[PDB]
Amino acid sequence: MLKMEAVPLRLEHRQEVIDIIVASFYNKADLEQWLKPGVLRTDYSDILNDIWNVLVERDLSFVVYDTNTDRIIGTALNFDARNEPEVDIKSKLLIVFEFLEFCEGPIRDNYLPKGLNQILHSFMMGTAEKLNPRENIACMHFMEHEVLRVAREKQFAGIFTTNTSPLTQQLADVYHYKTLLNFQVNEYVHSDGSRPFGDAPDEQRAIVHWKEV
């Protein structure tokens, strides 16, 4: 059985965290696959390097160790939704972040609690590339359980996230997250009038999820 431990993010975790996020997203991500070509691995690592110090100092994120091997197998990166660093993105990834703000913004600022230390934003979750299905599912359940623990212990009101893959969407449902928006990603229109995910099937959703703590 996979034995795991959640450890607060440290400064020296940067390369291990970058490796997990790059592997977990690049090519794999359900939105960026429709922005091909022009998405590079460094687009993800550039964003993470730009926020790394603030990410560690806010003390809301963690890594997951396989206690048997003492190696990092997953990571959960979190911010206060109302206290997130201002990063400017060069790549086509900016379209992804603008779409997520399209989904999250109106709901966050008009229906969720006001003030700092209220909304815990689960903004990245990833697992190591070499995990088999059993280990991936176990790690996801573990991080989902620990994000809840951080939320209560840090006195947040709830957890807020947009889930863009079928597995993360279904996990959120069985963990009793409330669905606040179920958006068809091929209907999103960019500022230039194009639909950057327009080639996606009608069944690909972006789901805004909220769980009171």
Stretch that binds Ca ion, among 2-10, 11-19, 40-48, 183-191 (CB under 5 A): 2-10
174 near Ca ion (CB under 5 A): no
1 near Ca ion (CB under 5 A): yes
CB atoms within 10 A of CB 105: 11
Q: Give the residue with the Cβ less far from Ca ion, 136 or 162.
A: 136
How many positions of this chain bind Ca ion (CB under 5 A)?
Answer: 3
Stretch that binds Ca ion, among 84-92, 130-138, 162-170, 175-183 (CB under 5 A): 130-138
Distance, in Å, from the CA atom of 67 to the CA atom of 74, rounded to the nearest integer, reads 12
Q: Give the residue with the Cβ less far from Ca ion, 138 or 151.
A: 138
Stretch that binds Ca ion, among 81-89, 114-122, 138-146, 200-208 (CB under 5 A): 138-146
Q: Give the residue with the Cβ less far from Ca ion, 132 or 191.
A: 132
Q: Give the residue with the Cβ less far from Ca ion, 89 or 137.
A: 137
- Total H helices, total E strands in the chain: 5, 7
Stretch that binds Ca ion, among 19-27, 134-142, 185-193, 195-203 (CB under 5 A): 134-142
Long-range contacts of range 31-38, CB-CB < 8 Å, 24 or more positions apart? 31/96, 31/99, 31/164, 31/185, 31/197, 31/206, 32/92, 32/93, 32/96, 34/185, 34/196, 34/197, 34/198, 34/199, 34/200, 35/92, 35/95, 35/96, 35/196, 35/197, 38/91, 38/92
132 near Ca ion (CB under 5 A): no
Long-range contacts of range 92-96, CB-CB < 8 Å, 24 or more positions apart? 92/32, 92/35, 92/38, 92/39, 92/43, 92/196, 93/32, 93/39, 93/43, 93/44, 93/47, 95/35, 95/190, 95/196, 96/29, 96/31, 96/32, 96/35
Q: Give the residue with the Cβ less far from Ca ion, 20 or 140.
A: 140
Stretch that binds Ca ion, among 44-52, 135-143, 144-152, 164-172 (CB under 5 A): 135-143
For residue 3, the minimal CB distance to Ca ion (Å) is 8
Interface residue with Ca ion among 64, 77, 128, 138 (CB under 5 A) is 138
Q: Give the residue with the Cβ less far from Ca ion, 80 or 135.
A: 135
Binding residues for Ca ion, rule: CB under 5 A, are 1-2, 138
